[PDB]
Structures are given as structure tokens and as C-alpha cells.
Design a protein around this ligand. Structure first.
Ligand code: IMB
Ligand code: IMB
Lengths: 398, 398
């Protein structure tokens, strides 16, 4: 049985992760759960998985949770605050750490797990976007095994040779017969929309994800392909890949999750249903496999699979992300920050769908900052990009 | 780097193999080339790769080769006969033996390489189709390493976890998280043809292989799907798969070469150009990669990829193969034998296209002998199934 702490257990990934342990109680044991303010869900989780510790990121939620657990008879030790989260992510006992706390708050805890040499199930994919360097450096200096939970990166992981799977992040791609990494995306809902109409697209239209359903912010990112841009940035750090070793390909059906091209012409791909339990279960069980609860993909009920090259005039955000990577970590975290503001602004109906890319570009032009040397520096860049982003939204909205 | 013997060097696979060698001088050294009667090519190959030995089918063909090699200044030593052919596959200083001699011949030579514990580049279907059990028991005894060269089997191997690859046939699919092997095939030229018309199809119509060109006998095998049936038989032996661990899908475009599904929902696949140098280069460099000279496939220049389940009314040969497996090596050897006679008879316009499956089934029901104990036994079953089959064809010509 492997012991693990789930960073961000009340969220979607967290629940999908707990579902997987539910399918394999003999294989996994939850030692600790860490969450934010969703006390009700945290209570059910503690009552069902009996963790040694339950941590909230707030004293008000911790006491509120502590009262309910005691009322229910649970003796799970309650804690509060980011420091506690970091302690859970470094417990001598635990083997794996499901890093699913999104945003800045996930940085330090995830870093703690890495330093503690734990096996990290990286769901907090945005932490490579901002601390790619720091994180990969720390990963190598501790030999902590990184296992990407993101569907695209996981697909690539599974399609990569074993020597790279181990030593992930500092292994030599070319030396292992790998030509390039093929990152796939659906192209969003506006794949075939006339460029002329992109400026008038509405939040509800942009939120109609082509295949499966998901959050509004991440849906918009899928429509601008910024998600693919952020994933591009992450992949470069994660698989130690150069610009010429990366390819982006639109694949509307999203049956293939991503691929890897090899020296001899071979292309290895991972395919499957749109259910996060699959990549999650893959990482939790690696190098082996376990039942995930996901139905077997039925090839006889699929839409014909197609592919196409990404048109940059249609996806300026995708080009913007690629260009930013070559500029530095300051640029990528700034791009991420800005996109956070502009998308929320678009959803709030303050700016046009097309204003997302332009404003995003605009913020990077104004930044002009030095590459961070630590997390605290990253937070600094992030914060400055958000205010600049907010000024432009207000400047454009007024 | 690697010393190798090439069984059937003058054929298609053999040449593709030398091209990979020509592409990687520093990695492979040709120790021995074995062929039939094509002295012309054996000369150029011997001149270009300076093997130590070369053997031809008969003394005449060899006598002539020896003269030209001497006259051309070549130092290679000439031999002839099956025993010399087998001796080359067992040379102490040989690492890999590309087993590309097809049919009843090449059986003993590939068994020779297995018995010598070498790494076998299996590009000979006859082996597993007629001696599946004898051979897998043999490779298990000598610890020989089988690397499948055939496109479908190679794709499956590439999509299988490392523990299975290093222990082919001997490994356990379920313990390693594999739920099943997905064998793909184009479905042939008659994939869409009305069932009633199959009886009138001509050799020429049967020989229009859907995606790329190939032999007439093989094109026909693709039209009847006997092609996939034989591969189905091999796959079960090669990867130790049960009936329920096998799936046969029709994939018209042949971009996906085959796949394997895992317990967590993941499906790994191998894609590429229809060039044999890819799978050959793969087995030669395994566990690493080498240049094959094959153009990387362009995902933007493909036709929509589709799938469909094979209808046994349309492809009775497929089902026949599946049934023969349950009956043992005598049944599979008999099916293979009968099929060579009926296909050839079809090509000669002696029987109808639909007479192929009909007569294959029929000779199978007339066959007695069951479960051979050695190669000579299968050879005997082969010889008898051919005679029964020839009479079938001759009786039908009345
Ligand atoms: O895991 P990712 O990469 O964040 C996500 N990709 C996803 N790919 C396949 C299936 C999914 C099912 C549910 C949620 C996300 C999914 P996206 O690229 O943001 O759409
Ligand atoms: O290697 P296999 O698997 O025997 C063969 N598949 C093949 N796939 C791609 C290209 C080929 C070029 C020449 C001959 C056979 C080829 P088939 O399935 O018998 O058609």
C-alpha cells in the first residue's frame, strides 16, 4: 500500500483521485488531505478515507471542520495554514503527493514535496509555467520522481521511453531516439468560425467546450488555445525539450491525447476517454497499472479522427505563449497572470473575446522584468502583471 | 556495435535491413548473409557489406557466387545448404539474426537462432503460425529475445510495458495491467463490396491492396483477412494472449499499425508511414533508437482515421483462423498450408474468390494429425494439408 497526501482534495482532481483509491483500497492509503474552505466535502472525505491529518488553509475553516469531525466521532488531527500543507507534503511516511492545489498557494507545498524527495503527481501544471527552472532544478537535486497528471503531458509521458520516464526533466530526448513531442488540442469551439466573427463571440459561446464539459475559465483558454500555450511551456520544462522538438497539432475529436515522434519514424500515442481518472490512476500506479473506473474506449463509436496545423492568426495566444517561453520565466508567469485577468474580464463581459490575446500581448510588452530566482520573486512578477492587466481592462472598458 | 546474420538478405525485408545498416555503419556489422538463388543481389550486398560468410540455396547457385566474389575481389566465404543456413543463425559472435526467410524453409534456421539464445528479429510469420508452441517454449528455454518485425506485432510490442518486452511470450499480460491487444487491418479492397459480389471478384481486383502495393498472395490474404487471422494466431503466441485478450479492428487508412489497451483506460498506439524500415530499425536498435531513413509522417496530410468491427460473413477466413488456434498447431499449420494452395489456385483462376475460405475450412475438417512434437512433425502436417487442398482444387475443377 502506498501512502499519500492529497494537495487540494476537495477539487475535481482531488475527488477523481479519491475515487481511484476507492477502486483500489488495498493499493492506496490516504495519510493526509489538504484543502481550502469547502468544509462539508472535507468532512465526507475524512469520514470515508480516515486520513491521519486534515488541513484547511484558514483557522476559521479548520475549527469549523474540527467541530464537525469530533461531532461525527472522527479523530483526524486538524491543522491550518500553508506551512501545515507543506508539512503534509513532506511526511516521512507518505510516498506520493498529488499536487492539485491551483495557483500560487500550490507553489510552496509542491516545492516541499519535491525537496522531500517524494513522488509528485503533478496536477498543479501551472507551477511549471512560473517556476519551471526552480522546480526542475529542485527535482534533479532530490531525484524526486515527477509524474504529470495533466492529460496531455501524461499522454506524452506514457509515450516516452523508460529511461526518460525515470530521470524526467533532465534526461536527454535526442539521446533516447526522440525527435519531437506532439501536443494536441481540440482547437476549441471557434475552430471553424470566420475570423471576422471572433470579435463578437459571447462568453456562453466560448464556454461550449467541443467535446467534454468543464469550467468557464479553462473553457475560454481552450477557445483561445492559451491552454495549449501554457501546456507548451510546461512540456518544454517537463521533458527538457527545445523549440524544434515541440509540435502543436489540432485534433478536434480529442481521442488522441498527445504523441511522441521517434528517430526511426515511429510515432507513439496514448488514446482514451475524456476522464481524468485515467491519467491520475496511471501516475498513482506507475510503473504499473490499476483499475480506474473509466470505461474502455469503444473504437466503433468514434468520430473520424482528423488533424490540422494551428493557424496563428486564429490563435494569437498560442504564438504569444511560445514567444514568451523563449523570453524567460518572468514572461511566462506574467503571461499566465495577465490571461487570468483578461479571461475573467471577458467572462464578466468587460472586454471582447479577441481582446484577450491583444491585452495579454500588451501586458508582456510593458512588463520588462528580470527572471525570478525564487518563489517570492515569482509572486512579485505575478502580482505586477495582474495590476497592469487590470488597468488595461479598465482602460479599455472605460 | 551489433554483429548480425540476415536470413533471406535478397528479399524485401533483407534489403530494407541493409539500408538501415547503410544508415548506421558504426552500429551494425554484417557477419553473414543468407539467400536463395538470387546470386545477382547477393554479389552487390557482399561487396557493399563485406560479410564473413554467404550461403545460397544450392551448390550451383553458390558455386557461381563464389566465382564472382573471387573475380570481383571479395573475401567472403561461400557456403550452401540448409545446415549452413542454420549454422549462420547460430554463429557464436552473432548478436542479432534478422529471420526473413519465409515458408517451411527458414523454420529450422530461425529455430537455430532461438536455440543459440540470440536476439531474433522475427520477420517470418511461418514460425509462430505453424510452430507457435514449440518456438515459444524454445525461446523460453534458451532465453532468446524475440523482437517482432511485422508491422502489427512490432506496433503492439512498442505499445507494451517494458516488463513484457524483455520477456516476450513468457510474461503475463494481466499482471502488467494489460486488458487486451488490438490488432488492426485495412479490411482489404473488398471492405465495402456487396456480399453477393465477392464470388465474382477477380485476381486483379483482389490484388489492389488498399493503401500500398505488395505481393499478390499477400494482397489476396488482405482481401480475405486471412492476413489478420494468421497475425491473430501469432499475436496470441507471441504475447501470451487469450481469446478475450484479443481484439481485431478494421482501420482502413492503416496509419495506426495496432494498439494495446490498459486497465486504467489508456490505449497506447504506434503510428507511422507504411515503410518496413521503421519496424526493422526499431528491432535492430531496441531498447534504443536509430535512424531508418523513413520520412516522418505528416499528420496534416492524412485522411480521416476510422474504425469498424470485422463482419465474419464478409471475412470467414478471419474466424477460421481464430477457431484453428483453439484446435492447436496442427489446425493452424493445416490452415496456413491449405490457404497457400487455395490462394495460388485463385490467382490461377482455378477457383472463385469465395472458394478460398470454403476450401480452407474443408481441408481443415479432413485433417487428422494433431499437436506436432517437433519441426519435422509440423512439416509433415504441412505436406499433408497441401495434398488434401490440391485435391480439393482439382475436384472443384470438374
Ligand atoms: O488535464 P488538462 O490538460 O488541464 C485538460 N485536458 C483534458 N483532456 C482530456 C479529458 C479531460 C477531461 C476532463 C477535464 C480535462 C480533460 P485541458 O487541456 O485544460 O482541456
Ligand atoms: O509486415 P506485415 O505485417 O507482414 C505486412 N504489413 C506491411 N505494412 C506496411 C508496409 C509493408 C510493405 C511491404 C510488405 C508489408 C507491409 P501485412 O499485414 O502482411 O500486409
Amino acid at each position: 500500500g502506498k501512502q499519500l497526501t492529497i494537495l487540494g482534495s476537495t477539487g475535481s482532481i482531488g475527488c477523481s483521485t479519491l475515487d481511484v483509491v476507492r477502486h483500489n483500497p488495498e493499493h492506496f492509503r490516504v495519510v493526509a488531505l489538504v484543502a481550502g474552505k469547502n468544509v462539508t466535502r472535507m468532512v465526507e472525505q475524512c469520514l470515508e478515507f480516515s486520513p491521519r491529518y486534515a488541513v484547511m488553509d484558514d483557522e476559521a475553516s479548520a475549527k469549523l471542520l474540527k467541530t464537525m469531525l469530533q461531532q461525527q466521532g472522527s479523530r483526524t488531527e486538524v491543522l491550518s495554514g500553508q506551512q501545515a500543507a507543506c508539512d503534509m507534503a513532506a511526511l516521512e511516511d507518505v510516498d506520493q503527493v498529488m499536487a492539485a492545489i491551483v495557483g500560487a498557494a500550490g507553489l510552496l507545498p509542491t516545492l516541499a514535496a519535491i525537496r522531500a524527495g517524494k513522488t509528485i503527481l503533478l496536477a498543479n501544471k501551472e507551477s511549471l509555467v512560473t517556476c519551471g527552472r526552480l522546480f526542475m532544478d529542485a527535482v534533479k537535486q532530490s531525484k524526486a520522481q515527477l509524474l504529470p497528471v495533466d492529460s496531455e503531458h501524461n499522454a506524452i509521458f506514457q509515450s516516452l521511453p523508460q529511461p526518460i520516464q525515470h530521470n524526467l526533466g533532465y534526461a536527454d530526448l535526442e539521446q533516447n531516439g526522440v525527435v519531437s513531442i506532439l501536443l494536441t488540442g481540440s482547437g476549441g469551439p471557434f475552430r471553424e468560425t470566420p475570423l471576422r466573427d471572433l470579435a463578437t463571440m459571447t462568453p456562453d459561446q466560448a464556454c461550449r467546450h467541443p467535446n467534454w464539459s468543464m469550467g468557464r475559465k479553462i473553457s475560454v483558454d481552450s477557445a483561445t488555445m492559451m491552454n495549449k500555450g501554457l501546456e507548451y511551456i510546461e512540456a518544454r520544462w517537463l521533458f527538457n525539450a527545445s523549440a524544434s522538438q515541440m509540435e502543436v497539432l489540432i485534433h478536434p475529436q480529442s481521442v488522441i491525447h498527445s504523441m511522441v515522434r521517434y528517430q526511426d519514424g515511429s510515432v507513439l500515442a496514448q488514446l482514451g476517454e475524456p476522464d481524468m481518472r485515467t491519467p491520475i490512476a496511471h501516475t498513482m500506479a506507475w510503473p504499473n497499472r490499476v483499475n480506474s473506473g473509466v470505461k474502455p474506449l469503444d473504437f466503433c463509436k468514434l468520430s473520424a479522427l482528423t488533424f490540422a496545423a494551428p493557424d496563428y492568426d486564429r490563435y494569437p495566444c498560442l504564438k504569444l505563449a511560445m514567444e514568451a517561453f523563449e523570453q524567460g520565466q518572468a514572461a511566462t508567469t506574467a503571461l499566465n497572470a495577465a490571461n487570468e485577468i483578461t479571461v475573467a474580464a471577458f467572462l464578466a463581459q468587460q472586454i471582447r473575446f479577441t481582446d484577450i490575446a491583444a491585452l495579454n500581448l500588451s501586458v508582456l510588452e510593458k512588463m520588462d522584468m528580470r527572471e525570478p530566482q525564487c518563489v517570492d520573486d515569482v509572486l512579485s512578477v505575478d502580482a505586477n502583471a495582474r495590476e497592469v492587466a487590470r488597468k488595461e481592462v479598465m482602460r479599455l472598458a472605460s
